[PDB]
Symmetry: C4
Subunit: 213 residues, 4 copies
Amino acid sequence: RFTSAIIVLIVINAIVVGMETYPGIYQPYQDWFYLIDRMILWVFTAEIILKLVATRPRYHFFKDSWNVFDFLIVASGHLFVGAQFVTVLRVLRVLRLLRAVTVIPSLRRLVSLGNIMLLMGLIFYIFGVMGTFLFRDVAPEYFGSLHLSLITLFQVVTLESWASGIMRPIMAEVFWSWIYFVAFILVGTFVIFNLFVGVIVSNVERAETEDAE
Amino acid sequence: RFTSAIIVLIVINAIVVGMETYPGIYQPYQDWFYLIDRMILWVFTAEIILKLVATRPRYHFFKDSWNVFDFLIVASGHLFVGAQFVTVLRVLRVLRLLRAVTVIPSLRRLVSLGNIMLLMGLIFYIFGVMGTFLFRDVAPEYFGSLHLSLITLFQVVTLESWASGIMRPIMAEVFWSWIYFVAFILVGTFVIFNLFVGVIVSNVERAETEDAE
Amino acid sequence: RFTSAIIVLIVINAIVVGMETYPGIYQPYQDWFYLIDRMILWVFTAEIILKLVATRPRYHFFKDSWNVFDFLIVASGHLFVGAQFVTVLRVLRVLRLLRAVTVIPSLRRLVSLGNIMLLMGLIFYIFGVMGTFLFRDVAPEYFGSLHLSLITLFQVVTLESWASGIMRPIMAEVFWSWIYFVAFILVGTFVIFNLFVGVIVSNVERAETEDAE
Amino acid sequence: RFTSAIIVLIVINAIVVGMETYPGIYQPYQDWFYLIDRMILWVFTAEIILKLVATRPRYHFFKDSWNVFDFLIVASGHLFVGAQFVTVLRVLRVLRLLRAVTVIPSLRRLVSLGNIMLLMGLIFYIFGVMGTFLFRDVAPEYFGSLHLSLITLFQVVTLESWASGIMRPIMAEVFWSWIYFVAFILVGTFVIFNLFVGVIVSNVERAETEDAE
């Protein structure tokens, strides 16, 4: 019943945080949700404390990642409303909704690429700098800076409005721009496909390892 | 021949409902399709009744989901044209075209995510509220409300016009907006891929279970 | 050498057809490509005839689909330039480039859904008619007609500009329009994924059947 | 330590090339990065030379593709700043960042379609020419030329703004244009899916061959 009680509050406070967003609800029942917040934080501190002793020596609790998360989460919520950064700590309190992941199984269940990731990162950097020198002057919004180039090239990998929005217009100035992007799309696309082809093989392999165990 | 006769009418009435849409056809042969509708509903009531007795004791019919569906469908079509909600019941009559699914096999053949679905739902809620507070004032159409945020964030997951349509314009006001969406896209995208990676493993597993049976 | 000779011409005439497109090239070497066309058609008729006798009794040739294709293709190209439909037959001549598929292996190599396809078709028809009645008046371009609805709903399945281009604007008039499309997208998307999940299982199964053979 | 030393410089020069992009940084520390470039090129020439002798007889070095790449890369960087094409050789120097791929394993690890690729290429050519004759006059930007048609048809395969951006507008002039594109999309899409269905089967097969070895 302990866990169920906690999971319940999480959902309850979770829905309340959404109500706290509405400026309207805030005028009438501003305090009501305010107090309920103080109450939940308290019950959670008590919960955390209990768990601490029960975990085994207090140490073990600090060993578990899920527990430490719940600890840190509650800690931030504990910090007085006022503070150097009243707002940030105030907003980070919403992170407690993440408690839902820890408290309930399965979710945690769901929650080998580095190599390819690094290669791709290198690729983006290369084309990012090249693109900047190639279209920054004429297209300052997209290619103006290295960071602007990074974001635009990420947009093209997602293939969102790459032609109509980016390439077609750029071709007006530079007819050969297609030479730059088509190849980029091919390489980027190709890697992504292989990446997936690799994640699933490791997936199926895990299934077999599971049967062995 | 009984089933074939029924499947035939379904297709016939199915094509007629499409004709009933055209205001033009309505003027000339309005009545012709009108009468054909009354006739089909009748033959279907007779059909349903027959099935009821044949199913075994009348009970069994009420046991089958496909049969109950056909029952409820026909029932709605039975309700007099006029009624409190003449229109709704009148439009719901089109649901009888769904009879095609029940009557013919295979279709029914085609017709383990909850966990991930819940996690994602939680995620959208979190970002939905955050986005509302972050861009609602400046971007009332997209972020104005919690529900508006939900729809816009769903659009970005589909990756449709996220950059050109949403992000680029939002960056004008908030340059850091990219920090909010890129991460969102990664998380959302990542889950989706894993979700698929899981549905297919359960799929292939079913294939093996089938051979065992 | 016979086949190689034929494959060569195909590629040669194939490149020529592309040149025949340019109005410029047409002025200078209009005749040159014109004559080369007559020559190739002739050599192909001779080829077809030879094959006919060689196939075994002439009959067998008419048994093979690839051969009949090549036959029909050449036949159309044989029809005099002038005719009732000088243009159509003239343009259909380009179909001979398809000879490349027949003549060369592998291509033919590359070149269980019906059930789902039918279900989906039914689905589109249902929503197509519903959409027409729902937004045709206000949105005649997209929903104006049943066929217009079909094309727009196909666009949304491809997920191309569904929100920014279609849904967002439609919401201006109808705020609940999202209720109609989101569900549509889910159903359509879901089926597509399962469809793929099925094509690949049949694919892998074929691989195993191949090893058995 | 030798390799680590080299991998380090690569990353260091890699970050410097990105700084060399900024016109601002260029004014203050233009020379500083300039000299560091000369120094790295030197250490790399020495590196290449050492490897040459160590490879076994100098020959073997010239046998390895990775080594030859590193050789050619450095060679271009060696060419004096000034030259017939001062700029091109100057820009190609960035290719040395590719050294990262050679020097570090894994990347190289990541780095059976021809048949389908050829078929698709043929397909694009066919539709490319047809599209040109069909919409070039009215739509010169998209269909104006054979090459313009190629790029636009590639855009539609990516499914980016095909309807809203291309098809819808084209329908204004030609209502039947949908007949041309829908089929194109189906064929192109279908092949792509099968292509993937084939790459992964070869992938999984390699996994099995690996266990055999």
